UniProtKB/Swiss-Prot annotation, chain B:
Domain of life: Viruses
Record's subunit section: Binds to host ACE2. RBD also interacts with the N-linked glycan on 'Asn-90' of ACE2. Cleavage of S generates a polybasic C-terminal sequence on S1 that binds to host Neuropilin-1 (NRP1) and Neuropilin-2 (NRP2) receptors. Interacts with host integrin alpha-5/beta-1 (ITGA5:ITGB1) and with ACE2 in complex with integrin alpha-5/beta-1 (ITGA5:ITGB1). May interact via cytoplasmic c-terminus with M protein. May interact (via N-terminus) with host bilirubin and biliverdin, thereby preventing antibody binding to the SARS-CoV-2 spike NTD via an allosteric mechanism.
Name listed for the protein in its UniProt record: Spike protein S1
Whole-protein coverage range: 350 to 399 of 1273
Biological function: Attaches the virion to the cell membrane by interacting with host receptor, initiating the infection. The major receptor is host ACE2. When S2/S2' has been cleaved, binding to the receptor triggers direct fusion at the cell membrane. When S2/S2' has not been cleaved, binding to the receptor results in internalization of the virus by endocytosis using host TFRC and GRM2 and leading to fusion of the virion membrane with the host endosomal membrane. Alternatively, may use NRP1/NRP2 and integrin as entry receptors.
Length: 49, 50, 49
C-alpha cells in the first residue's frame, strides 16, 4: 500500500516534468528559443511572436 | 520562368548590404524579415533561385 | 518598351536559407574573438547566442 505515498511523489514529479516539457512547445511561434526569435525577427514585429 | 535557375551557395561569407545599394532595387520582401540583420545570422543550405 | 507601366520586364531573384539545423556552410560577416573558460559570459556560437 506504500504506492499511496508513492503516488503523491510521482504526481509532483510528473507535473514538474510536464511543465519542463511545455517549454519546447512553439505555441504557434517561429521557434521555442527566445533569443533566436529576436535575432531572426526585428523588434517592430518580434513582439507578436 | 520555365528554368527557375537555382544556385546552391555554400562555404563562403555572404554580405547582403551589397544588394541593398545595388541597382537601386525598387522592391524587396523577406517573409522572415530582419533585412538589416540578415548579415549577423549564419545559414545552412542557402539555395537561391532567379 | 512602349507598354511602359504594364509589362516592362522585372528581374526577380529569390534566395532561401535554412536556419541552424547543422554546422553552417555559409555565414554572414562577423568577427570572431577568443573564447574564455569558467567565466559567466555571453556567448554567440555560430548564431546560437
Amino acid at each position: 500500500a506504500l504506492g499511496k505515498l508513492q503516488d503523491v511523489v510521482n504526481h509532483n514529479a510528473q507535473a514538474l516534468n510536464t511543465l519542463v516539457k511545455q517549454l519546447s512547445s512553439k505555441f504557434g511561434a517561429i521557434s521555442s528559443v527566445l533569443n533566436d526569435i529576436f535575432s531572426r525577427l526585428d523588434p517592430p514585429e518580434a513582439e507578436v511572436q | 520562368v520555365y528554368a527557375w535557375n537555382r544556385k546552391r551557395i555554400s562555404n563562403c561569407v555572404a554580405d547582403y548590404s551589397v544588394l541593398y545599394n545595388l541597382a537601386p532595387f525598387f522592391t524587396f520582401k523577406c517573409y522572415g524579415v530582419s533585412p538589416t540583420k540578415l548579415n549577423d545570422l549564419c545559414f545552412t543550405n542557402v539555395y537561391a533561385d532567379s | 518598351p512602349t507598354y511602359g507601366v504594364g509589362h516592362q520586364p522585372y528581374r526577380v531573384v529569390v534566395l532561401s536559407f535554412e536556419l541552424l539545423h547543422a554546422p553552417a556552410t555559409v555565414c554572414g560577416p562577423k568577427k570572431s574573438t577568443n573564447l574564455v573558460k569558467n567565466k559567466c559570459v555571453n556567448f554567440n556560437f555560430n548564431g546560437l547566442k
